[PDB]
Amino acid sequence: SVYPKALRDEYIMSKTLEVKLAFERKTCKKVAIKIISKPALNVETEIEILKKLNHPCIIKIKNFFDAEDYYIVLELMEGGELFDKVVGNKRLKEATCKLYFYQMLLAVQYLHENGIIHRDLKPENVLLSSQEEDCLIKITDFGHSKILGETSLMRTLCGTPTYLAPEVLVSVGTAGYNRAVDCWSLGVILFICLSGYPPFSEHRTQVSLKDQITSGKYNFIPEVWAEVSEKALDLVKKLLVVDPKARFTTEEALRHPWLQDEDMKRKFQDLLSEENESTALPQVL
Amino acid sequence: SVYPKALRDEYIMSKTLEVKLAFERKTCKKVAIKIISKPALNVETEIEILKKLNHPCIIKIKNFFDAEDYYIVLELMEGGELFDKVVGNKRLKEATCKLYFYQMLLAVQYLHENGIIHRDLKPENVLLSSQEEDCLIKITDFGHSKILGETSLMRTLCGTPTYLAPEVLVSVGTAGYNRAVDCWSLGVILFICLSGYPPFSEHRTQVSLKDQITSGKYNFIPEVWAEVSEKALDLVKKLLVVDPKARFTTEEALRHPWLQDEDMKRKFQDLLSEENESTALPQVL
Numbered sequence: 001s002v003y004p005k006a007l008r009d010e011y012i013m014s015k016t017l018e019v020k021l022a023f024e025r026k027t028c029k030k031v032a033i034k035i036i037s038k039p040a041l042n043v044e045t046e047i048e049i050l051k052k053l054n055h056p057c058i059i060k061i062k063n064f065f066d067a068e069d070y071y072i073v074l075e076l077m078e079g080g081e082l083f084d085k086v087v088g089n090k091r092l093k094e095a096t097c098k099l100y101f102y103q104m105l106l107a108v109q110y111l112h113e114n115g116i117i118h119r120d121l122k123p124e125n126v127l128l129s130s131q132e133e134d135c136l137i138k139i140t141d142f143g144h145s146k147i148l149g150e151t152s153l154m155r156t157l158c159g160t161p162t163y164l165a166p167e168v169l170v171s172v173g174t175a176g177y178n179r180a181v182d183c184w185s186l187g188v189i190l191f192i193c194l195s196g197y198p199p200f201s202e203h204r205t206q207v208s209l210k211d212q213i214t215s216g217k218y219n220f221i222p223e224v225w226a227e228v229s230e231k232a233l234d235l236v237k238k239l240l241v242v243d244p245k246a247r248f249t250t251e252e253a254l255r256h257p258w259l260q261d262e263d264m265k266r267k268f269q270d271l272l273s274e275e276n277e278s279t280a281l282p283q284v285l
Numbered sequence: 286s287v288y289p290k291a292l293r294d295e296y297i298m299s300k301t302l303e304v305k306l307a308f309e310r311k312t313c314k315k316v317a318i319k320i321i322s323k324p325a326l327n328v329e330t331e332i333e334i335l336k337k338l339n340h341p342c343i344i345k346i347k348n349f350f351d352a353e354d355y356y357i358v359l360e361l362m363e364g365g366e367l368f369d370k371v372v373g374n375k376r377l378k379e380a381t382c383k384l385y386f387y388q389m390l391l392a393v394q395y396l397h398e399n400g401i402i403h404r405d406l407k408p409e410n411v412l413l414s415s416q417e418e419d420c421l422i423k424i425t426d427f428g429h430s431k432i433l434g435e436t437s438l439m440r441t442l443c444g445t446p447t448y449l450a451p452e453v454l455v456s457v458g459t460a461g462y463n464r465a466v467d468c469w470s471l472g473v474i475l476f477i478c479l480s481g482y483p484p485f486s487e488h489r490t491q492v493s494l495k496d497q498i499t500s501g502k503y504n505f506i507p508e509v510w511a512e513v514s515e516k517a518l519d520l521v522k523k524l525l526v527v528d529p530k531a532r533f534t535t536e537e538a539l540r541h542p543w544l545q546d547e548d549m550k551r552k553f554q555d556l557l558s559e560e561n562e563s564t565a566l567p568q569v570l
């Protein structure tokens with residue numbers, strides 16, 4: 001198979017990284033083109049979302065092609081995937097874990113604020129802006145994302161439940177906390193970043209991964225965790241809470257002591273203006 | 286407002302019954318036109334369903350108009366709504382409750398067999414084929430219906446749950462029993478038909494309707510129920526089961542002793558051929 005004419009007309013395709021590297025002809029700038037074979041639903045959704053959202057720590061869509069396959073043009077992230085930073089028990093310096101996690105929270109906070117649930121948060125979907133270890137991170141892959149509204153339960157709650165089944169009335173209790181699944185994923189991510197190993201795995205253990213996760217009983221190795229602060233460990237503890245309604249929200253996390261770090265936040269504000277310099281159009285005074 | 290030209294071109298609109306009576310010009314036959322103001326989703330869904338399904342105890346769609354409002358052309362049911370047969374504590378003869386409920390089960394069985402969940406079963410949506418008390422019933426109003434497939438949970442179960450949240454794994458236990466909400470509604474319907482009064486109501490009671498339903502503790506009045514058989518009461522007991530996974534399915538109901546009644550079933554097979562006579566095109570022998 002070859003690339004669609006319409007694509008080749010604006011872009012020069014290059015290496016693979018499914019995601020390949022491409023060059024926009026008009027600008028000679030680098031771009032990342034994600035190829036998705038033909039699904040429509042998950043692709044329609046992702047596009048609709050990418051177009052509506054705009055936030056520093058959220059990947060932006062530049063172009064899109066509906067051909068024999070789906071082609072999604074995105075801004076290229078020099079840093080690559082966060083996954084390559086933690087694979088094989090690589091341990092990230094805490095100060096940078098914080099810097100990253102802060103951005104992740106801002107992003108997921110943003111999504112939730114806008115009624116979006118990512119649902120597939122993992123190191124593979126966190127992109128770094130540069131080869132520097134101090135950089136911007138951006139969230140990506142909204143193919144599994146969910147959008148909210150009307151819920152139909154609301155619609156049913158408006159009517160008399162004479163003929164309504166018990167399980168549905170019961171569901172009222174927990175309705176509206178689906179977003180908490182993202183906060184779980186973050187907790188699991190932050191755990192990996194901080195310690196270099198996953199909190200729930202089948203490595204040297206006789207309990208099923210399912211049991212570990214539902215019981216919330218993660219694998220805790222003091223030797224490794226001794227290098228990490230108490231504040232950092234505490235936040236993870238409050239994200240890996242089994243009870244969704246008790247689990248921390250992004251807001252509660254952003255307020256947690258471990259995140260009250262001006263040096264880190266400053267460094268973040270600086271990384272922004274840096275990237276925004278090129279885009280800076282003169283302002284009225 | 287007036288009716289759309291395209292509608293007036295095939296139909297002569299008449300009384301109201303939102304549902305109005307109409308006459309198809311080509312045949313001078315009577316039809317029922319349901320008007321729905323402009324929602325699309327619930328209407329698109331209902332149409333898609335009505336077109337795919339075909340079953341004696343399921344209302345059939347004859348035509349559809351997408352105008353300033355939505356117009357849905359359906360076959361007219363001389364008998365009207367089952368609701369008008371039970372309002373004000375009217376009590377239906379048991380033999381006819383059975384005859385009706387059997388058809389309702391066949392219909393809901395059919396829906397479930399075809400991955401459809403009605404979700405709004407009630408006397409108002411059960412139509413009688415004639416002014417006779419021995420007649421065909423047909424189910425209608427699929428505006429709140431749900432369709433099944435892929436569930437995405439399956440999609441998630443295929444992957445490693447390293448970053449997956451506990452509440453989702455827990456949901457696995459009960460996933461796939463949404464259809465049971467229809468069986469609840471039937472139980473509630475059959476209760477009304479049999480006794481002339483609703484099993485869960487705020488009439489003379491200090492417990493909230495919600496509590497009644499979730500506890501499954503229905504209002505049982507022996508005086509009224511003394512006129513009804515034990516088999517009939519037993520089936521209702523097995524449909525008004527709080528635990529969805531324990532609740533009776535349509536199949537379990539169709540197998541219940543109270544439904545093992547050849548006189549009733551015969552009378553049903555007879556009502557069919559009767560209605561199918563007019564449609565009967567000569568067969569090869």
Ligand SMILES: NC(=O)c1ccc2nc(-c3ccc(Oc4ccc(Cl)cc4)cc3)[nH]c2c1
Nearest residue numbers: 017019032034074077078079080081140141
């Ligand atoms: N899940 C997605 O929807 C998605 C969306 C966009 C993505 N961009 C990458 C990516 C970016 C850079 C990589 O190394 C490089 C390669 C070249 C250069 Cl000059 C810098 C870093 C590897 C992967 N992965 C992506 C995934």
Ligand SMILES: NC(=O)c1ccc2nc(-c3ccc(Oc4ccc(Cl)cc4)cc3)[nH]c2c1
Nearest residue numbers: 302304317319359362363364365366425426
């Ligand atoms: N919920 C629906 O989507 C729906 C779909 C179709 C419906 N047809 C009626 C109906 C039928 C007959 C009625 O009395 C009559 C009127 C005239 C005659 Cl000659 C016989 C019975 C009343 C209501 N109600 C309907 C509701």
